Symmetry: D2
Subunit: 241 residues, 4 copies
């Protein structure tokens, strides 16, 4: 009953599972009408149907964020059917495993850069007309890896430092149109591979998925109306250690 | 929204400006508020206006540079309430002086004394109460804790110090379940060209737009956030 | 006369013009043997031939840093002929003009990301065996735009923030091999002003309105910090991005 | 023999031992005339006399950087005898051990803030006239603790974050006078919180902090101001 996103239209990418599904549900619980898209359209539609059954307003579709024609088609549809977009959450992303001095780093780099950076660019750029019409806002999914190397593969680290910068320059160019642009920077969340994080996090625990959803909703809401260009760590103290 | 329902919140510098607005905002989110200020008359006037609206509030004089007076307030809070759910360190001052001027020394001592040394005094003294409640701390940092901007040296340094204080308090108090964070505002409604030329939103923030992020950080919405300094600056630091 | 890079083999990309040419000359003056490469092989060879005429040891080649096959061929040639590489300077870079809400931003993004980020990755990754053999080091060309948006187009800002992160993670993965990885982050320097018709009126105001020194940097003032980071003076510095910006980022 | 500081007058605080003594020696080896000051004047003079015995030009004095009268006296002496100061290195500093929730943290805080931050302010502010006359530059000793909490006591972490900010605002106010202001941010100098995160898996040698200080103090850094340079084996990038 908090209603931070009351009657706002919210598009979440990568919404078929994990954090994206949880952001979609959290936005709906804050009053939003939610468009869920995912490379797996069946999963996006299943999440949307579950939200509809709970009494929320939601729809799901397949979207490959690396396909510029498909991204443009979705943007055109949103503008036509709704007149604008109040919130874009760029959550679609992947990770991988490879050290920089390994040949496998190249394939991993291309895959991860392609979804995490180039896909976020595609969706963000295509949705500018709809965001302008509604004076909406954008929340990107950054990472603690956008600030330090941590333990992730090079393509992931670089994609998230790239998102940090994308947040700043989108904020600059879209401020004259009343569009805020921010990002969250989680550590590891519920949705010795993790020792690099667990050995440094002050709270000595992995964050609950809801604990990343809440800051996303905050940044997308009028509580954050003087916040733009900003990346908010949600990391149990990792970057302060 | 009930974000702070029945939580006890202490705000320093609460007799005027942002501090009074944070106090009112916490009360509107369901908190019981202790307002303290160097001007105890103003703190009690703010507290009485909250009481008239049906909130639970009280006001006191507090000089944050007086360690004895700070300790007496911390002892009072622990004895009367058993703990403290939120500390907001908002008391602060500024001044005008370039570094190469003799006046920079007096300004430096005054600003460091309130903004940094006073924040240390209050933070350190309230640790027992914060431990008992597993409370949290929100400091008032500034864009000046990240770049020099246009503020006097003592102010810039005091806010960079607060940025570091946020991190190390978070480290030492995490084992006790205490989160420690800060907001970093730009120039506030409560010359300024250095800020206005760079702020992306091309406007000064409303006081309520700094209150809301403080309430967010003090609330369970921020339960996995600690050691963090959140700019509330209209895009200034991203420019 | 300092000999900070005495007898080291240095590879500079984008070395046919501007800052890249100046880094190549500065490295040679510090005692290095320099391989200059540029998308324009004729320009790289003209710069290398001028260094040879001056009395230095240098060679020039064409290299498209976006062509992974060409990059691999150069890396194989360096390893075979020299057995390793002491310094890699990833200087090749481009910019552009387009606001994010314009359709033109896409073509500019693709071009700038392609050279600045993907090219730096191509060259860095391909040269790892040569850098391991020599225990060499890498200096990337970042920018103040890797820290704030400034006045640059989105593809440039993002490419330079990406380079900042690339510096960190390369440093992490190559430190066990004795390879340091750092970057400089310049503001504007004089080489970027050398073509008058491309200096749009007011185009430097984003920088000049903030820089504490109230001047564009001399090209040599960016060359010197590159040489420092590439030298044993910086033997405990890795993963670091050094602003060379007249105070811009501190303002 | 790179001569990066040839004929420059360099003042180093905390110069009686450790890094400060090494910066003084390294500055002399780069051509500088060096004034060494330390809370222990005997140690400052011992370091200075050793440099004199090598044919360098050096002198040593006691200085308590927390004593504003004594700092002013040294500034007046430098202006009178030399007319300017080419480099100031603020290296005097202390640390301590106390967790924030302990009562001992207050005394440790006061001691560490007093030397590291307030002493750096005292010396920097008092030497502005001499730095102006020479268009000199300042190098502060920051720390990785000015960027993250690491393992140091609260007063140390806060003192170094304060120095990071002091670097920026001194650079701003002194740039119109041709004075650059920078800092180095070392890690642990010649511990698991540091060692487990440093990429080079070693503590830096003292000479490896001296060289970046000399770089920042030199014309190689003539377009560098307001900057804090980590000298930390990759710790802050990890």
């Amino acid at each position: 009953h908090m209603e931070l996103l009351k009657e706002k239209l919210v598009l979440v990418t990568g919404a078929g599972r994990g954090l994206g599904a949880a952001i979609s549900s959290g936005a709906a619980e804050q009053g939003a009408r939610v468009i869920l898209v995912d490379i797996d359209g069946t999963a996006a539609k299943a999440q949307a149907d579950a939200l509809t059954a709970k009494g929320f307003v939601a729809e799901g579709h397949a979207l490959d964020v690396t396909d510029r024609d498909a991204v443009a088609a979705l943007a055109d549809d949103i503008l036509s059917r709704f007149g604008g977009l109040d919130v874009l959450v760029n959550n679609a992303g992947v990770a991988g495993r490879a050290a920089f001095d390994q040949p496998e780093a190249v394939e991993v780099w291309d895959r991860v850069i392609g979804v995490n950076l180039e896909g976020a660019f595609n969706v963000s750029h295509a949705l500018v007309p709809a965001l302008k019409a509604a004076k909406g806002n954008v929340v990107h999914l950054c990472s603690v890896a956008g600030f330090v190397s941590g333990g992730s593969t090079a393509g992931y680290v670089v994609s998230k430092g790239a998102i940090r910068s994308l947040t700043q320059v989108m904020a600059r160019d879209l401020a004259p149109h009343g569009i805020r642009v921010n990002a969250v920077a989680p550590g590891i969340m519920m949705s010795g591979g993790t020792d690099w994080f667990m050995n440094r996090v002050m709270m000595k625990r992995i964050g609950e998925t809801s604990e990343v959803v809440d800051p996303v909703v905050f940044l997308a809401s009028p509580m954050a109306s003087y916040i733009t260009g900003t990346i908010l760590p949600v990391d149990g103290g990792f970057l302060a250690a």
